[PDB]
Design a protein around this ligand. Structure first.
Ligand SMILES: CC(C)C[C@H](NC(=O)[C@@H](N)Cc1ccccc1)C(=O)O
Ligand SMILES: CC(C)C[C@H](NC(=O)[C@@H](N)Cc1ccccc1)C(=O)O
Length: 290
């Protein structure tokens, strides 16, 4: 059973779940996506504890069970400092591996750019170094959808009528094709989605949905900074990932020595679509860079 707590970090109370032992070989911090989701959908990574990998989960500022800070702090830079504060105020000076999913991936990239000296390795899953680029690729995905849904997206989407059933059915389709390719989504994934809708971070930083990123990060782009990352890096992406392998390729190019792995028959939530394979890949990576 993991150890759960609700302590104050860089000024605000953050919820975290530390799943450690047995025979710990390394520690791994995880950064969920959204922005504005919760750690819940990453729980499948908990399996790695059986491989000697302690896993740290936590809900970022304003996310899930964590308290929301002042609006002025709704930035990726703030998320990075929040993350370093948690690592230090939990593992002291220990070197740790960092894993980020989607937005969590971009956040993990920003973190590495500044604090890679506190890391043994970096893992980015369905991540991005440029929101604009990700939008470009997502737009292509929308057009590749059957006219039926594609039209509803451009129609109600351009009218801000996200409360329409046709538009809604179009979003559901896109999700079942590029977010999670499953007819029965796990409770953990559903909980994080619910959390995003309940809090404000998702609406303020991201936007109405996965492919309608009109939040405060819409222009965020640090592709020209990531080349400064020199630590072991593992980049993963799903074949049908809403954050396409083309976006992943851009990250891979800049980080020398990094690895790029495309999960066939998978989309964005690769940790659920191929749980055993996803965990094995990360476990082998971590264990080979102690
Ligand atoms: C639906 C939630 C749980 C999934 C999440 N998705 C994201 O992080 C998107 N915000 C990706 C994005 C695109 C462009 C610019 C910023 C972010 C996840 O899988 O973690
Ligand atoms: C899309 C419906 C079923 C809710 C839920 N989606 C979310 O919580 C957002 N991340 C995406 C969203 C899409 C459309 C309308 C509101 C939110 C889900 O997919 O389970």
């Amino acid at each position: 059973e993991c150890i759960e707590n609700y302590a104050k970090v860089n000024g605000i109370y953050i919820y975290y779940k530390l799943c450690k032992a047995p025979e710990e070989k390394a520690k791994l911090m995880t950064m969920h996506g959204g922005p504005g989701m919760s750690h819940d959908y990453l729980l499948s990574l908990r399996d790695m504890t059986k491989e000697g990998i302690t896993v740290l989960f936590y809900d970022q500022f304003g996310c899930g069970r964590s308290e929301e800070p002042d609006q002025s702090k709704f930035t990726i830079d703030y998320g990075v400092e929040e993350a370093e504060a948690l690592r230090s105020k939990l593992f002291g000076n220990e070197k740790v591996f960092l894993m980020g999913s989607a937005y969590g991936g971009a956040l993990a990239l920003a973190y590495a750019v500044k604090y890679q000296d506190h890391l043994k390795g970096l893992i980015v899953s369905g991540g991005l170094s440029s929101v604009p680029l990700t939008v470009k690729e997502m737009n292509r995905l929308i057009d590749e959808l059957p006219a039926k849904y594609r039209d509803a997206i451009k129609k109600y989407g351009s009218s801000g009528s996200y409360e329409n059933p046709e538009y809604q059915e179009a979003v559901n389709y896109f999700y079942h094709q590029h977010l999670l390719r499953s007819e029965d989504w796990p409770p953990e994934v559903l909980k994080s989605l619910e959390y995003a809708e309940r809090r404000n971070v998702y609406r303020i930083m991201n936007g109405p949905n996965e492919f309608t990123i009109t939040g405060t990060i819409k222009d965020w782009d640090i592709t020209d900074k990531i080349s400064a990352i020199k630590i072991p890096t593992l980049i993963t992406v799903g074949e049908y990932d809403e954050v396409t392998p083309n976006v992943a390729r851009v990250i891979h190019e800049k980080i020398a020595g990094s690895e790029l792995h495309v999960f066939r028959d998978c989309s964005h939530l690769t940790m659920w679509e191929d749980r055993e394979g996803y965990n094995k890949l990360l476990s082998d990576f971590i264990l080979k860079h102690l």
